[PDB]
Amino acid sequence: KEPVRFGWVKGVMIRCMLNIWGVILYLRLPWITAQAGIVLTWIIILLSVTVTSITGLSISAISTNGKVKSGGTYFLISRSLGPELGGSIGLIFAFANAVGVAMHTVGFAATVRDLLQEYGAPIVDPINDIRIIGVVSVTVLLAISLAGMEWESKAQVLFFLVIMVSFANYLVGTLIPPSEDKASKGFFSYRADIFVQNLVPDWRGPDGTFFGMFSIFFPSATGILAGANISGDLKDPAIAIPKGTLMAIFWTTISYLAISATIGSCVVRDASGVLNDTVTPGWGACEGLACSYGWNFTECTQQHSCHYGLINYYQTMSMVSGFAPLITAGIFGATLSSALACLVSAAKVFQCLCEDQLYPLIGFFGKGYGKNKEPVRGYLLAYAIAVAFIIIAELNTIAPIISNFFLCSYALINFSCFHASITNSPGWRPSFQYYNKWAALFGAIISVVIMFLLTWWAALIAIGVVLFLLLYVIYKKPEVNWGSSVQAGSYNLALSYSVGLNEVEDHIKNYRPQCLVLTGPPNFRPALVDFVGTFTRNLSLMICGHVLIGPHKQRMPELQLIANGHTKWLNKRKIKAFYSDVIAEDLRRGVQILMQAAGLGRMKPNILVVGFKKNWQSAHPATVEDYIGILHDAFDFNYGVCVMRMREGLNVSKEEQATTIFQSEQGKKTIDIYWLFDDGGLTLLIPYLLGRKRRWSKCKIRVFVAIISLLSKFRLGFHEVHILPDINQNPRAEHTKRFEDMIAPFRLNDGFKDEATVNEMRRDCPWKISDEEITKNRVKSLRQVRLNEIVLDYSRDAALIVITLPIGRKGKCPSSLYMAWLETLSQDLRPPVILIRGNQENVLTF
Amino acid sequence: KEPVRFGWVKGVMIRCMLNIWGVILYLRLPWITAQAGIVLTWIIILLSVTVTSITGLSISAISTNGKVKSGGTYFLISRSLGPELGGSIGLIFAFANAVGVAMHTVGFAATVRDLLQEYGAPIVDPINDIRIIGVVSVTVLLAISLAGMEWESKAQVLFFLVIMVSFANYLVGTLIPPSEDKASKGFFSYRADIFVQNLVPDWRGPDGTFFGMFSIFFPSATGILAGANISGDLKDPAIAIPKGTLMAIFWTTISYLAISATIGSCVVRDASGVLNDTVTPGWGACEGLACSYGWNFTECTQQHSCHYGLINYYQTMSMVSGFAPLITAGIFGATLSSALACLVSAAKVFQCLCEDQLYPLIGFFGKGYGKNKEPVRGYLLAYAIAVAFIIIAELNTIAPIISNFFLCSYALINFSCFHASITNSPGWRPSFQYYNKWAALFGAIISVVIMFLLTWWAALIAIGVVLFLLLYVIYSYNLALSYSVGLNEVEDHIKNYRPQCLVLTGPPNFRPALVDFVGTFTRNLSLMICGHVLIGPHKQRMPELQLIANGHTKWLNKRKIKAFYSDVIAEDLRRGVQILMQAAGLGRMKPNILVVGFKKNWQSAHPATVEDYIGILHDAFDFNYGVCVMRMREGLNVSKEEQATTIFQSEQGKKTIDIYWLFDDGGLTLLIPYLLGRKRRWSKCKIRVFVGGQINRMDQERKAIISLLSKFRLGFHEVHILPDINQNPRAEHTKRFEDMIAPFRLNDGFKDEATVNEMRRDCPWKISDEEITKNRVKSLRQVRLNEIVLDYSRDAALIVITLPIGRKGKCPSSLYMAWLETLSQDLRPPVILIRGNQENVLTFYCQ
Amino acid sequence: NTIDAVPKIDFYRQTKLIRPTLSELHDEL
Ligand SMILES: Nc1ncnc2c1ncn2[C@@H]1O[C@H](COP(=O)(O)OP(=O)(O)OP(=O)(O)O)[C@@H](O)[C@H]1O
Ligand SMILES: Nc1ncnc2c1ncn2[C@@H]1O[C@H](COP(=O)(O)OP(=O)(O)OP(=O)(O)O)[C@@H](O)[C@H]1O
Ligand SMILES: CN1[C@@H](CSCC(F)(F)F)Nc2cc(Cl)c(S(N)(=O)=O)cc2S1(=O)=O
Ligand SMILES: CN1[C@@H](CSCC(F)(F)F)Nc2cc(Cl)c(S(N)(=O)=O)cc2S1(=O)=O
């Protein structure tokens, strides 16, 4: 009580050979041999079999790299190039299959109609004959297909046996001495001179050109994917697909090469068909090899006006054989087997395509009925399409379009083997080793050259329909993640250039601002991701750091899920940033890890962007110590610092994503800069790079500072320049008392004692301030509140204010004093405020 | 010395007008009007300026979006579709211009030569006159263009005045009553019965069909990018480029529409040209229309063999003029202007490509060229190509592929606007009143349709040569940064797993063996990062430290190894390795395997070093790493010109790679040898795989293992089974293990776990005997497996055993190191101990 | 569970037992 699975002979080889053998073998191959001669016909066959051999090797390498399921061709292409190029070629493969059902039932019906005219009486109408017969035949084929998959595989064997019987009949017939009405039509039994004179071309008519023969034959050698299309019923598709496909191609090619060279050595190109053309002694003259055998076709050859022979009579292969009705049976089998093999493939590819939710509302047809889960709804859709194209019944101009839907699949079956083999993902491990990627690119190019040679305006329609669906799938972005080779091309494309960076040494004319941004969870502080992603996009590096403060010291898998959530959040905003997190016991010791290790060779951060600690006056005085220690560590590691503040705050935690200030047009406002120390040029570069952006390009960069000589020489292009007024002068008293009573809870009331005893008493906590430093660094303390007054005077209603970050000497001043300066310097201002100081490096050399 | 800037009426509108106007205006348009009639010619003109106006709208939309430089056209295709279409289309667009220079100077050359045949005496054959004069004309244009673009604007203004006097001459000559000589050739003044006679087509000839007329005219209406390629020389492009480009189109279309009607309202289609055809009163009956004016043109119209008239004489508009030579002056202006516009617009694009750093294929630019940065090298390249194609002198065969190199650019320029509009690309917000993404998609459909309609095989070479350039470049800082950030979208699959190593070398030149080994199989495949921990105080970027860190990168580069160097500072090795594990890498390119060397003399150094060494592995297992430990017989540290040579630089030959797959770790034990065997040195080796099994299930599970190894497509040759691992080892080997573990033995008698910590805090590496009893079976397994390995793999090339794993708090460091040293002792080839992280790295399936 | 497993086919299939995790083999008991 298990579903049946097929071997390789009965499952791949028989079906591929039945699909390849059509009606060209019977009704137009002798004609091609007569027109083009044996040698050039052999060239045509061996030239049309090169393309299908190359595609067989490609589809055979692709299908032995894992386990294959239902879906056949579509499954193999989509899982190897992804849904964009896989779901656009799996919707026209099925449609082309359905129309192929239509165009082979039409041929079967035409043969039946031609049989019925002569023997008895034709029915209803010449053209309304090919409608009735085709519709009834497709209904019968639908029934036999819909009855199960062990009954169709019993019909295909019957058709194969019928074809073999026709071949044996023809070979037996071509070996008996010719009867009198048999030789009057051209057929002499076997010789040498007919062979010799049939070796060279004899073109006639408007259709008799070499390319006019290649155009007729080539679409009759494709059809090799009829066994790979039932890959869900084979019991070992990793051994059944290569052997079956390649053996089928070999055997059908031998069949063609034998039929042509055997028909061309028996029947002469010109014969009359009248039993009275026997040669009369002593009269006139011969016109050819015929008169040596006693027959006289001179009037034909002189007038070019008779019906029989290897050119003029299309059904010569019926006349030659011992019993023509068996050749008729062969034609019936050859035409019905292809229709059945197309009807099955359309449904089994469409069901797989509908399982994967790639297109809006065709998912109704991806349902299985029964134990084997046959697509009882795909069969009926293909039947409806085939009956619709059979009612038309004149498909002589539809065929060029359909035959180019099958050459877009040959061009993507071959590119999928080239692309996946030049990449070498570990895991790209096929067990069919007899292929080459350059011979697979060759086939991809030729399948597109031929598609235009055959007819240039149907290739245009085919490629237009391919791109329409390709673009739809790109713009909808479904989520599948099948691990294609396009996804593995990105990694080694990135690695090849990251390793390439090493070759170029460190210079001074390639400075870039590469930022390490201390965000925490990017959700919490978006106003600090936007500011940095404004001026580093498409120019330099930015990393969004994060320290997980806990004592766990183990990297649980759940942390990688969280790091995938934050990366996706960054990707929604279209920020070009990297996320990285570490684990430490406090915040100061995680940023040390990030500064020391992060980056890749030459692409490593050299600027530290950190928010401002708003609540430093109501937190434990040991956290401000860590906060100032971070800045001191950044200075020791030879970084540049940028402390950023806002009036309302940075942490937003204390659906849609949040919107901040740095996302909107800020036209007609000024960007104020207060240059107080030659840091090298970082205080000037950040607003210079910020103002070039469109959102900030309508702003007036104002610089408040020999200086004009130093400014214009770097061609920065700033609007104004000024001299700040008298920073030395004493500020008014109320602000000064505010400064002194702000720093009061760090007072010590120590009077004056020797440094030894002072340190003996400070040993517990270093953040407390003694009166010695207070009275020793009171001047520059006043200077900060004075300059805050100045800034609050000029920059009251600006759009972005940049000042210079002071440095407090280690050991000579505590951290509380430095944080008090940093506070009072930028308080009670409305716009965003930044405080930059570089690392004494020439950065304006660009 | 401020750079010169141009307005909209002299740097865009005039400069596009001159490029649109060619020689079809003077030699072919009257013929089109004669054949297709007035109405259908108007249809052709409007139907072919629809496309150019749509592309003008897209270019105008691009111009009002930020600021771009001169030659920065491809820069949207580059931004919106990747920098391999951007650069490729830019290269194609510049080459097409360079060829257009030659194809216009040849028209000027032909005009001058045919003028020479009439008046004076030609001095050479009529095919080397074209060559001998085209080169001189192009050289003169190169001189007056290399002079500076101030001396090119003046020439383009002179050329405009010349055309405007040719129009004045032609328009004056059609209001004057027809002279006896002129009227014999078919010229009559404005009369209504000629207007109504020419309103309908009169097709004749091989290419006298509507498609033939469209195919002659349409490539005479393009050239609307002549002023948009110099966006770096305009005063304010966002206001000058739309207003100028969209009025050049309008006024040239007006001129084309006016000439056709005015010329068709004057001249009959057929005429004789001999003054004998004055009518004879009373001589039968007339035939034709001119017989109402005094002229009989019957004999031609019956025999169809005269030479003049609007249908047979191409120069019919040079005779209706008041003075003939002014029309040839118009010809000279019309050809030399387009030749100059193309020469400037190709130099701009070449110089922009040579300045582009996301397209490092062209480059070729060294020292700066010119005080004003004139694109001197771009000019020389364009001049070279133009001369090379002049020397050919036959170009009607090359015309229909150079004319599709432009419609490829039109199609992609139009499609990138639609793409960037519909994907809501950040940085594309064009502030232009009349831009529609649908109207820009239509202009990209139509451009390709026309491209393939004009001639299909030439449109296939044009697409084919773009894809060769696209594929050739797929197979510095701004390119590495743009691809690394592109990995943030592609999401990981087990089918694409890559082993990304973090190699602990030290100074890379102390341990060449590790570097060579790990650079064998990660080469062109995955990441590897050399590591180095400078044990000591903390401080950084000392001028010396960076200069040291550059020397080791130079050493890695000389040896031809694709690796990164990374040094951190800590107080001991363990903390430095933790710092390196947690934070090294960039995004998805971060290590997930840690490879170290073997502690050669772990029995002589202080045991705290052994404790830290084993702690390194214990931490690697805590961060989800796979661990490889590499042991070599002589040692890895070479310290204890020329670069030293290791055994991993020689071809190994036909020797074997024995793998001992004991515990299932995911597949890393047997993915390293596979990748190792994809290389030249190891490509002849034989992979033998050993597994454990039972006596009386031997073949039944050998077959199962062989079936498993062939679902993975690994291609491993042998498979053996070891059924005697649970035996007892020989006596002296167990005695050696027990003596080699003696110094670390606690020797505490037998006490409970509560008090063992009491005397083991001082030395946490010591082994309590209650704890050495519970590990006797596993301890003897290592000796037995060592005997097996010596028995089999004595003469192999590389040996792989799985790493035993020890629980925290259940096995001390000394015991673990004793196992690691027992498993791989007294054995000649390199030994590697691998342990994956218990996750699958191999797969059967496709999804 | 907690004991290291010799190679089997059952760990690599899809649909019966689970390969021990790295934390199960390494963390304390
Ligand atoms: N866990 C963390 N990881 C990384 N960076 C952090 C972390 N915590 C804080 N920072 C950085 O240090 C800055 C100052 O820390 P602090 O906790 O004072 O900010 P905050 O109090 O969250 O800001 P707000 O006043 O807006 O709440 C933060 O703005 C942030 O830039
Ligand atoms: N300063 C260092 N930085 C980075 N890695 C190191 C450093 N020192 C040692 N290692 C790595 O740790 C391993 C431990 O070996 P250790 O240095 O303790 O003894 P060794 O005999 O010097 O090592 P080897 O056998 O490699 O010479 C070494 O093999 C090496 O790979
Ligand atoms: C003869 N066929 C040609 C198309 S040219 C004849 C024309 F269509 F024009 F009539 N190519 C294929 C290819 C495949 Cl792959 C399959 S199938 N069943 O494997 O999927 C079937 C066919 S075919 O039978 O339609
Ligand atoms: C008259 N030209 C036609 C091509 S007609 C066929 C041919 F002559 F090429 F054989 N198309 C363009 C388009 C542009 Cl956009 C530019 S330009 N100056 O912007 O670069 C120049 C030209 S043209 O001068 O070559």
From Swiss-Prot, chain B:
Region of interest (Scissor helix), ranges: 476-486
Annotated effect of mutating D664A: Abolished sodium and chloride ion cotransporter activity
UniProt binding sites for polythiazide: N19, N97, H104, T222, N229
Spans through the membrane: 8-37, 38-59, 91-113, 126-150, 151-173, 209-230, 242-263, 324-347, 378-392, 398-414, 438-457, 458-469
Tissue-level expression: Predominantly expressed in the kidney (at protein level). Localizes to the distal convoluted tubules (at protein level). Not detected in normal aorta, but abundantly expressed in fatty streaks and advanced atherosclerotic lesions (at protein level).
Intervals, Cytoplasmic compartment: 60-90, 231-241, 348-377, 415-437, 470-847
Keywords: ATP-binding, Cell membrane, Chloride, Disease variant, Disulfide bond, Glycoprotein, Ion transport, Membrane, Nucleotide-binding, Phosphoprotein, Sodium, Sodium transport, Symport, Transmembrane, Transmembrane helix, Transport, Ubl conjugation
Reactions catalysed: chloride(out) + Na(+)(out) = chloride(in) + Na(+)(in)
Result, substituting T262I: In GTLMNS; complete loss Na(+) uptake activity; partial loss of localization at the plasma membrane
Subcellular location: Cell membrane; Apical cell membrane
Annotated glycan sites: N276, N296
Outcome of substituting L407F: In GTLMNS; uncertain significance
Binding site for ATP: L504, R511, V533, G597, L636, N637
Disulfide pattern: C286-C291, C300-C306
Effect of Y256A: Strongly reduced sodium and chloride ion cotransporter activity
Activity control mechanisms: Phosphorylation by OXSR1/OSR1 and STK39/SPAK in kidney distal convoluted tubules downstream of WNK4 promotes its activity. Also activated by OXSR1/OSR1 and STK39/SPAK downstream of WNK3. Target of thiazide diuretics used in the treatment of high blood pressure. Thiazide drugs, such as polythiazide, specifically inhibit SLC12A3/NCC transporter activity by competing with chloride for binding and by locking SLC12A3/NCC in an outward-facing conformation.
Amino acids binding Na(+): L18, W21, A334, S337, S338
Membrane topology value: Multi-pass membrane protein
PTM field: Ubiquitinated; ubiquitination is essential for regulation of endocytosis. The BCR(KLHL3) complex was initially identified as a candidate ubiquitin ligase for SLC12A3. However, it was later shown that it is not the case. Phosphorylated in response to IL18.
Binding-site residues, chloride: G223, I224, L225, Y410
InterPro entries named in the record: AA-permease/SLC12A_dom, AA_permease_N, SLC12_C, SLC12A3, SLC12A_fam
Job of this protein: Electroneutral sodium and chloride ion cotransporter, which acts as a key mediator of sodium and chloride reabsorption in kidney distal convoluted tubules. Also acts as a receptor for the pro-inflammatory cytokine IL18, thereby contributing to IL18-induced cytokine production, including IFNG, IL6, IL18 and CCL2. May act either independently of IL18R1, or in a complex with IL18R1.
Xref: PANTHER family: SOLUTE CARRIER FAMILY 12 MEMBER 3, SOLUTE CARRIER FAMILY 12, CATION COTRANSPORTERS
Protein name from the UniProt record: Solute carrier family 12 member 3
Record gene name: SLC12A3
Swiss-Prot record, chain C:
Entry's localization field: Basolateral cell membrane
Domain of life assignment: Eukaryota
Residues with Phosphothreonine modification: T2, T15
Subunit composition and interactions: Homodimer; adopts a domain-swap conformation at the scissor helices connecting the transmembrane domain and C-terminal domain.
Biological role: Cation-chloride cotransporter which mediates the electroneutral transport of chloride, potassium and/or sodium ions across the membrane. Plays a vital role in the regulation of ionic balance and cell volume. Important for maintenance of endolymph volume in the otic vesicle, probably by regulating ion homeostasis. Also plays a role in normal development of the swim bladder.
Family membership noted in the UniProt record: Belongs to the SLC12A transporter family.
Protein name: Solute carrier family 12 member 2
Shown stretch of the complete protein: 138 to 172 of 1136
